[PDB]
Amino acid sequence: DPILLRPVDDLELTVRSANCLKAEAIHYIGDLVQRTEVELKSLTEIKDVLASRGLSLGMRLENWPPA
Amino acid sequence: AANKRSVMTLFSGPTDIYSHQVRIVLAEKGVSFEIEHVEKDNPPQDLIDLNPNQSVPTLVDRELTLWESRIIMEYLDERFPHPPLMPVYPVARGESRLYMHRIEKDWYTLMNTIINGSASEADAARKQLREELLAIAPVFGQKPYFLSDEFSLVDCYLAPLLWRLPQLGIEFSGPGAKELKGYMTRVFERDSFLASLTEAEREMRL
Amino acid sequence: VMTLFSGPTDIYSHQVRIVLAEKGVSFEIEHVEKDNPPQDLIDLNPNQSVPTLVDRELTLWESRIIMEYLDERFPHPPLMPVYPVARGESRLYMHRIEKDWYTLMNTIINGSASEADAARKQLREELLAIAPVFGQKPYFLSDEFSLVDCYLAPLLWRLPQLGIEFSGPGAKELKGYMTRVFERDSFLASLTEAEREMRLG
Amino acid sequence: FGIDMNTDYTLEEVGKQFDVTRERIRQIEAKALRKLRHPSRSEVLRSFLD
Amino acid sequence: ARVTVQDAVEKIGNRFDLVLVAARRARQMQVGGKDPLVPEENDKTTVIALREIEEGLINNQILDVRERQEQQEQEAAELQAVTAIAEGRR
């Protein structure tokens, strides 16, 4: 989608729950569809943000990122 | 006491236009104020003790009450700046303080006289009033407001005295009401007016 | 071109003159008959009420507008506060005196000799009300003369013609005022030949 | 700034406008204008600088 | 698409009026955009205005009743929407 190739803060996510994700060395959002939950109040705040713009968890996305 | 907070204190009037003229500019700047629709025979206690002149309305902010229709709506336009309500050029500024003086001394007496006048004056005043308000018809074509693009205080002196149009028995007549009557569609339904209108003063709209 | 339709006598016309001659405005006055200028000002003044200012584009008829315009346009020296807290003090303190005292002096002149006493002594006890406070500032609630005292200098000057004066108290901390403001060149070079025979200054 | 108004204003000069006088007023503008600084809220604003 | 107005001037036997009617109808299709009655063929708004005048569906008379009918039906949208302040206030 066009809603994959954005800066990790460009989803307007909330700072502490943005800090939990980002401080753990995440790179881009297109891989956020590939984000597994075993790799991570911090759960509500990644959930309604992906389920508001057209994003989602544990998706299937290959050949990415080629810059 | 009354001014014990950083909040205002307004012993407004529920029908007296001084309140309704003030509250427009009072709320048009987005400030958290206190409304107290109170009477002349029996207002609240604070409105009579700290108010050594006892008028309506009366605004009190941490230092003293400020009683006037002009001193109040001036104190707010000079202390709460944005959005602005009065121009910058002192040439065209004090003239904007002149229509307000050619209304409180021109179209106020036509309201009190129709409140305490004889049977013919009530239409005599309504005679000198209704046609005269049609003598100012072509103004609105040029400017979207009373000779000023922005919504300024000189417009706020009209609408509260254009909201009591038929409430004291008035209706338009003649050619060119579509310029002024259509104009009332541009001012009578604004956030500064809609949220500010007192429901008591509304029922004379149907 | 800045004309003025001042009265030669009335305190209102004496009000505006203190503001003009203070700021330094190059003006020119056109007198009125007694307090009635000609019928040739109804065209630029449907009220025909002095004073009235005319400077090339403008018409203004009130002590409020005519006297504050000259403040908001000729900036220095300034005759007002700086921050909005205190203007409402000055802007409203001058609403007191223009409502209580000034129309009080009607019956003292426009009211019969009965009511002249009705206004005379009931007002005198007010005249020494703020009198002790002059040990706070030099001027009327200000360390530097401002617009608020502009309604007193042409008011105090009309005392001996009016009739009420100082006798014992009311002149201790009060008379220092008029001996301090009546000497400023503004009120010096504003006095006229008609408004001067109301006292010996 | 003087955006859409008359003369601009001082920081705690506005503190008497929002009724909460403190060094937060140097913050609300501070972190908010960081939000306009991020991309796609400046994709049309950036377009004016050469 | 239009080289000559010799035929769109027989509905209006006057050159200095054809350049007034079509100068006004050719504005409605540009600002406050109404719809070209003719099927356009990738043309401007001017030549589309001069292609209605030939087929009689525009002239100095139709161009007012077509609109003043609307100027009051928006006032039918005045009063009928004036009920919105009629039932919103009571």
UniProtKB/Swiss-Prot annotation, chain B:
GO cellular component terms given for this protein: cytoplasm; cytosol
Pfam families: GST_C, GST_N
Domain GST N-terminal positions: 6-84
GO biological process, one term: response to starvation
SUPFAM superfamilies xrefs: GST C-terminal domain-like, Thioredoxin-like
Stretches assigned to the GST C-terminal domain: 89-206
CDD domains reported in the protein's UniProt record: GST_C_SspA, GST_N_SspA
Induction of the gene: By amino acid starvation.
Keywords: Stress response
Family to which the UniProt record says this protein belongs: Belongs to the GST superfamily. HSP26 family.
Chain's role: Forms an equimolar complex with the RNA polymerase holoenzyme (RNAP) but not with the core enzyme. It is synthesized predominantly when cells are exposed to amino acid starvation, at which time it accounts for over 50% of the total protein synthesized. It is involved in the transition from P1 early to P1 late gene expression. Rnk and SspA can functionally replace P.aeruginosa alginate regulatory gene algR2.
Protein name according to UniProt: Stringent starvation protein A
Organism: Escherichia coli (strain K12)
UniProt lineage: Bacteria, Pseudomonadati, Pseudomonadota, Gammaproteobacteria, Enterobacterales
Gene this chain is encoded by: sspA
From Swiss-Prot, chain D:
Subcellular location: Cytoplasm
Region: Interaction with anti-sigma factors, residue numbers: 22-37
Phenotypic consequence of R34 to D/E: 2-fold reduction in activation of class II Crp-dependent promoters
DNA-binding region positions on the chain: 11-30
Region (Sigma-70 factor domain-4): 1-38
The record's note on its domains: Contains 4 domains, connected by flexible linkers. In the active conformation, the domains are in an extended conformation, each making extensive interactions with the RNA polymerase catalytic core.
Subunit structure: Interacts transiently with the RNA polymerase catalytic core formed by RpoA, RpoB, RpoC and RpoZ (2 alpha, 1 beta, 1 beta' and 1 omega subunit) to form the RNA polymerase holoenzyme that can initiate transcription. Identified in a complex containing RpoD, the RNA polymerase subunits RpoA, RpoB and RpoZ, CRP and DNA. Interacts with Rsd; this prevents interaction with the RNA polymerase catalytic core and with promoter DNA, and as a consequence, promotes transcription from promoters that require alternative sigma factors.
Similarity-based family: Belongs to the sigma-70 factor family. RpoD/SigA subfamily.
Task performed by this protein: Sigma factors are initiation factors that promote the attachment of RNA polymerase to specific initiation sites and are then released. This sigma factor is the primary sigma factor during exponential growth. Preferentially transcribes genes associated with fast growth, such as ribosomal operons, other protein-synthesis related genes, rRNA- and tRNA-encoding genes and prfB.
Protein's UniProt name: RNA polymerase sigma factor RpoD
Organism annotation: Escherichia coli (strain K12)
